[PDB]
Amino acid sequence: MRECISIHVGQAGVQIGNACWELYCLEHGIQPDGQMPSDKTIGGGDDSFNTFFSETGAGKHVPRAVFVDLEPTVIDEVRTGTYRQLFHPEQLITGKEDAANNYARGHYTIGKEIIDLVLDRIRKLADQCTGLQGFLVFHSFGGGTGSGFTSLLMERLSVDYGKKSKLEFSIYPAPQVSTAVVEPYNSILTTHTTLEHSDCAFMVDNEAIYDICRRNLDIERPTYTNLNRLISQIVSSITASLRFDGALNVDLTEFQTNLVPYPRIHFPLATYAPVISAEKAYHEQLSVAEITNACFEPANQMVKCDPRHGKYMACCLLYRGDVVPKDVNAAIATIKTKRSIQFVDWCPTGFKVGINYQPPTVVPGGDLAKVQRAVCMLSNTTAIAEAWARLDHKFDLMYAKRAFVHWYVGEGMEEGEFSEAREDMAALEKDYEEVGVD
Amino acid sequence: MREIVHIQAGQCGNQIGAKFWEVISDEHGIDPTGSYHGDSDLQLERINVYYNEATGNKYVPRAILVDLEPGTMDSVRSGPFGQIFRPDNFVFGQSGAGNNWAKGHYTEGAELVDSVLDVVRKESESCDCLQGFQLTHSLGGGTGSGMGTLLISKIREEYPDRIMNTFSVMPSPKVSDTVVEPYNATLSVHQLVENTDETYCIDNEALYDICFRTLKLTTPTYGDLNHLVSATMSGVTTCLRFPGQLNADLRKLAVNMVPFPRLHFFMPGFAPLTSRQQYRALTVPELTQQMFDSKNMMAACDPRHGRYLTVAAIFRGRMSMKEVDEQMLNVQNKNSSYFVEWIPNNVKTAVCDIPPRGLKMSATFIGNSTAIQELFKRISEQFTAMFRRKAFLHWYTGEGMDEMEFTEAESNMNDLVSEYQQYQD
Amino acid sequence: MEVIELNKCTSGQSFEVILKPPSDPSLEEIQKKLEAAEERRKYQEAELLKHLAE
Amino acid sequence: MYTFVVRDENSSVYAEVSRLLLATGQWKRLRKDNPRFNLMLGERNRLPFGRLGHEPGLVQLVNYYRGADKLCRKASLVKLIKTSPELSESCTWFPESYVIYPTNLTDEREVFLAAYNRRREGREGNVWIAKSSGILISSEASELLDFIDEQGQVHVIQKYLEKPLLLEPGHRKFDIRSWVLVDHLYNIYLYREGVLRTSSEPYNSANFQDKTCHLTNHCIQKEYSKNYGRYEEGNEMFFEEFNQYLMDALNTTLENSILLQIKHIIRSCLMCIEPAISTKHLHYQSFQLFGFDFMVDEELKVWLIEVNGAPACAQKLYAELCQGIVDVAISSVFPLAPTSIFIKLHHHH
Numbered sequence A: 001m002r003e004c005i006s007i008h009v010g011q012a013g014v015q016i017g018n019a020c021w022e023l024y025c026l027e028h029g030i031q032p033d034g035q036m037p038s039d040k041t042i043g044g045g046d047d048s049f050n051t052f053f054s055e056t057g058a059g060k061h062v063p064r065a066v067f068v069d070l071e072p073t074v075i076d077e078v079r080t081g082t083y084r085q086l087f088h089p090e091q092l093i094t095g096k097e098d099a100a101n102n103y104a105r106g107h108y109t110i111g112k113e114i115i116d117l118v119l120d121r122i123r124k125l126a127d128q129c130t131g132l133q134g135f136l137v138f139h140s141f142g143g144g145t146g147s148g149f150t151s152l153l154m155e156r157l158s159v160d161y162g163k164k165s166k167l168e169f170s171i172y173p174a175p176q177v178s179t180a181v182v183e184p185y186n187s188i189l190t191t192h193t194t195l196e197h198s199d200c201a202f203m204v205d206n207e208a209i210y211d212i213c214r215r216n217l218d219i220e221r222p223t224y225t226n227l228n229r230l231i232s233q234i235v236s237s238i239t240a241s242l243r244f245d246g247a248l249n250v251d252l253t254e255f256q257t258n259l260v261p262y263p264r265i266h267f268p269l270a271t272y273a274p275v276i277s278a279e280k281a282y283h284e285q286l287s288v289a290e291i292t293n294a295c296f297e298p299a300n301q302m303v304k305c306d307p308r309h310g311k312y313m314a315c316c317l318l319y320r321g322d323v324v325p326k327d328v329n330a331a332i333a334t335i336k337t338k339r340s341i342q343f344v345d346w347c348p349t350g351f352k353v354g355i356n357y358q359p360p361t362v363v364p365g366g367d368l369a370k371v372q373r374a375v376c377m378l379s380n381t382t383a384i385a386e387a388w389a390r391l392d393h394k395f396d397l398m399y400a401k402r403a404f405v406h407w408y409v410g411e412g413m414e415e416g417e418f419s420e421a422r423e424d425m426a427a428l429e430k431d432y433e434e435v436g437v438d
Numbered sequence B: 001m002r003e004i005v006h007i008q009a010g011q012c013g014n015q016i017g018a019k020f021w022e023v024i025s026d027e028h029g030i031d032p033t034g035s036y037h038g039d040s041d042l043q044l045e046r047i048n049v050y051y052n053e054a055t056g057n058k059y060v061p062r063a064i065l066v067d068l069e070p071g072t073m074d075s076v077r078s079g080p081f082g083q084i085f086r087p088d089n090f091v092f093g094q095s096g097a098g099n100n101w102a103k104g105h106y107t108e109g110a111e112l113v114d115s116v117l118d119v120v121r122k123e124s125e126s127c128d129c130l131q132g133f134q135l136t137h138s139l140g141g142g143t144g145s146g147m148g149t150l151l152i153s154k155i156r157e158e159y160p161d162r163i164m165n166t167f168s169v170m171p172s173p174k175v176s177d178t179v180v181e182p183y184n185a186t187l188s189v190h191q192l193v194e195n196t197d198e199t200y201c202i203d204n205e206a207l208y209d210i211c212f213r214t215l216k217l218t219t220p221t222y223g224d225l226n227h228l229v230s231a232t233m234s235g236v237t238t239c240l241r242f243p244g245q246l247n248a249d250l251r252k253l254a255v256n257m258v259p260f261p262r263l264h265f266f267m268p269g270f271a272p273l274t275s276r277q278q279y280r281a282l283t284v285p286e287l288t289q290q291m292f293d294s295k296n297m298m299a300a301c302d303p304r305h306g307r308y309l310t311v312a313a314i315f316r317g318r319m320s321m322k323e324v325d326e327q328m329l330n331v332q333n334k335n336s337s338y339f340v341e342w343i344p345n346n347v348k349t350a351v352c353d354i355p356p357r358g359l360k361m362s363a364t365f366i367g368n369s370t371a372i373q374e375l376f377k378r379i380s381e382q383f384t385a386m387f388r389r390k391a392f393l394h395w396y397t398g399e400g401m402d403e404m405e406f407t408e409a410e411s412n413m414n415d416l417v418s419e420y421q422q423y424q425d
Numbered sequence C: 001m002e003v004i005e006l007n008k009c010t011s012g013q014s015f016e017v018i019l020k021p022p023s024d025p026s027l028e029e030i031q032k033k034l035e036a037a038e039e040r041r042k043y044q045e046a047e048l049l050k051h052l053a054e
Numbered sequence D: 001m002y003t004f005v006v007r008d009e010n011s012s013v014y015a016e017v018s019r020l021l022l023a024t025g026q027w028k029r030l031r032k033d034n035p036r037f038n039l040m041l042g043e044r045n046r047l048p049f050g051r052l053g054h055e056p057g058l059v060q061l062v063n064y065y066r067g068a069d070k071l072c073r074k075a076s077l078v079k080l081i082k083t084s085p086e087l088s089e090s091c092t093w094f095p096e097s098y099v100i101y102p103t104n105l106t107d108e109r110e111v112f113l114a115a116y117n118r119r120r121e122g123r124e125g126n127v128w129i130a131k132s133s134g135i136l137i138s139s140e141a142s143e144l145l146d147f148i149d150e151q152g153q154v155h156v157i158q159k160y161l162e163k164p165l166l167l168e169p170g171h172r173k174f175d176i177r178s179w180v181l182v183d184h185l186y187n188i189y190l191y192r193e194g195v196l197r198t199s200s201e202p203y204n205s206a207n208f209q210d211k212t213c214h215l216t217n218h219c220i221q222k223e224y225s226k227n228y229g230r231y232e233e234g235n236e237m238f239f240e241e242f243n244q245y246l247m248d249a250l251n252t253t254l255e256n257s258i259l260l261q262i263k264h265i266i267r268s269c270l271m272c273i274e275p276a277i278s279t280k281h282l283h284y285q286s287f288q289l290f291g292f293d294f295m296v297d298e299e300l301k302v303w304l305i306e307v308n309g310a311p312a313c314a315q316k317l318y319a320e321l322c323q324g325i326v327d328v329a330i331s332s333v334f335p336l337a338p339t340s341i342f343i344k345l346h347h348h349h
Ligand SMILES: Nc1nc2c(ncn2[C@@H]2O[C@H](COP(=O)(O)OP(=O)(O)OP(=O)(O)O)[C@@H](O)[C@H]2O)c(=O)[nH]1
Pocket: A009, A010, A011, A012, A013, A015, A016, A069, A070, A098, A099, A100, A101, A102, A106, A140, A141, A142, A143, A144, A145, A146, A147, A171, A172, A173, A174, A177, A178, A179, A180, A183, A206, A209, A224, A227, A228, A231
């Protein structure tokens, strides 16, 4: 058993982290007070769920998590919320004033004054691990803290934990639920300085989560709570292999091995199905073929793009519920004869499949309906470069006029870092085209 | 606990500041004696942004009243909510400023400024985390204009990294007290261009035309004008005074509104503006149409004469947030020629469940439009008409000022106009 | 259409299907970046205070 | 009030579509870089499909199917036909074609020579044609391959229809251009009006050196042919005249002898790539006008030559067709405040 430490940075990271650990507790039978009746080893144990929860002599199961925000109002919700008893105060770190959607303010000005404290708290969690695997870092692209302080934290993590893997869960900016105009700047600034420090990053576009909530859940105007409960379901699917007995993606290292043959191209596309409204009269349960076929529908992807016009480098099918390998292969065969699935010639045309018999857990009173089976597909498609193109375009429109640049320079950043980061994204976009296009 | 320190200077500044605290004190359930008597926790959620909490659960505004004559501040103290202000926060002289920027900035004002900064310091020293300052003043007089910008300059020196915000009433010949108002306004704009992050430009002519043409007030008074500014000030600060994510921070609002440091002069707008057919329900489409109509804007600049760099829109009341997004997306998509295309998604919408007193729902408009240059063009033309003949300059040279100082302020304001014009193309 | 590495346990099973075969900055350098930016902010504030003192 | 942008200033077609759109008073044209548009008349090369369908509140539509190049590229079409079971290598309406890369760069050289040697051995007509996206007609394989090596781009060698159908009087070749419009629902509409681009020079099977009577392109006839515009105006015969000819000469109709095969070919091609380019469940919608070029041999068999992705229209047919593009392709998604000119080729989606 090897521990994983989760780090949540900024508003988006914290609130999403809140929805994930809520879900983790319901999955592992942990109560809000931290007690776990099914855990017969009191005060310790090296079970699969122990990679995310430590244990005290009093039988409390404590998440291996750190929450960080340069402003306290969001993390104050955790301190007084339902799961206030899960975390001890050392794990919840807050400043007094935020980064104001300003990468430079979160990276340089405020980051410099709080970085050593954060590492000290992370060091405390690491000291409790007998074999730390690495970190899962939740953050947004657009926020000043999520973008600016995460990139600094990732740099230091590579210094203090050189041999440790680091995976990201990043929120790609969407104007329908965003009030910051400079998020393209922040997204590209943070991807530039983080790229070499992240081994595998799962981008979630708020635009996609938003439309899934409107289309499948019949939420006219979705909220952050609606978005985050759905995001935590996808996150749960991805991290389930680390928290349950299994043989696929059993450690963080296996994510890079199974999903990233080329280091810079480490952004797998996530696809999830089925998302059914709990307000429905009653739904006809979907089969293995129907939910699998849905994994190739753009409407169910975490990032809207067209894999038909990219090339695949890896593909994992993570099933939860009543699924036997027989029905999986039968659905894949049928999908090959009907779908456009082009792999890169230097990669095998195959699928790594994981099945967890326990069907997806749903938060009581939430929006999702209880389904007998579900799947999350992780595929490394060059088509996800469409998201980089969109983002780079908005960057170019504003930077051509130097719009808003004075805010970043005023925080001690040099203007040259803008074009330095933009040139890195141009290289990233070129790598995708070399691998996917002919 | 993100406290804002409020300052109101001069006659116009204090009379408008008074109505402002009167309007928001009502929204937050604070009576004239500072006691809370509301029925919603949303009222006190962010109450400490503008109010200090004294003994006995009393809420005292964090406001500093400044003037060079006692008259106006005597009225405030004798006014409805006069008891609500901290008595020590009344800082005033006796000489007056004679509608003379030089007197407020160099001679009379310079004698009183240190004692005002002593009150500013005492208020800041209690703030858990001071966001910044907001000043309400006019630019056409002597105290608000001259001493106001003096206080800003001295506040920048002592708090260089805090946000500086102002509500500035621009003079107009149609609603004028003295002929020297263009002189005082050009001198103030010179200061404002350099020393504020955000300035809400409020043109007394727009407020007049609105009271006469739209509100059907035969003979508008300063009180009538101030009612509009009260409603506008309450609207543009809703993001700060209640729980929200759009522009909940003064610095965050500036980051999303100010693409270039010198272009931070906004056109505020409000809807509805109904004349006494006043009970009729206003639909979200109507709220949006009016909020973007020039007739509902208070800078007296036709937006169709320029382009929006950024736009902030706050909707108040229980309404269809889905229908809000649609109508907002309808305005942009139906007039995208008036929005610069090199700032993607430059229109941000915020919603607040608590409506203003006596309104089912309303909308407040904050625009950073290049059309504001027309406001500075008017002032520049009035300025030059007198300055070419050196008319009325002796009032200023008598206080130790040189003509060179006038020439530099004028040149800077014309530069400001040229910058608005280059981004308009 | 071959299945490989079939692993089964009580809580689930995994396998692999193949349809077709194929064909950093140091601690010091970070402190310098942070302290460099902090110095540029200090210079900008000293220029402001110098301007205000004038 | 809808909005649209124009990104191909060289499109004679959509320039008229844009003209009609403005003439309705309910469409407004925006700058070519303004993202708040309902309709994009996109560029031919490197159309940024990945930026479409991400504008909140705007239903966006573009006039090109992403991936249609597979059908409209000489080398791609050959590969699509041989590799797709729906078309198969035994496809009867497409000439025997091979993809040949110049030796200075898979490649079907040896496969081509095998079929070539077979024809030369069996006394069969062994005349092939080489072309690319600069054409050579020859009966010797040595000349076709040497001509491609002198170039530096991909080429295709397909059988040359030695027995084309010749119109009389004149004894002249020709080809048929069919305009096909696929809308966002992937309905396939065949424009009722076609055009025969005829050669004004008598066909000569003993001299492929003078390519004026072998290539029926409008540019080559109006530049290197001395009988241009003799028989028909602009070497363009329309279906009405062509049908009457088929009745007087061959005692048959254009519908029975040629149109059935054409409709079958259009359907087969477009239905084949439908899974790859369909925008049914996509965040944006696509339509596209296609120009199919067919050949007709002396047995009244119809062969597919190529498919153009950005075709032009006959001068006499711009009005009707462009208006038809607005009705079924643009107004079908953005309605405004017959006797259709198209023929719907019904198919199973
Ligand atoms: N899915 C999701 N997105 C969020 C959430 N909260 C914020 N975001 C997105 O994150 C972006 C804004 O960044 P934030 O995380 O709020 O900012 P921050 O990291 O706290 O940094 P600061 O500027 O210091 O506040 C916007 O694009 C939001 O749409 C959330 O709870 N769920």
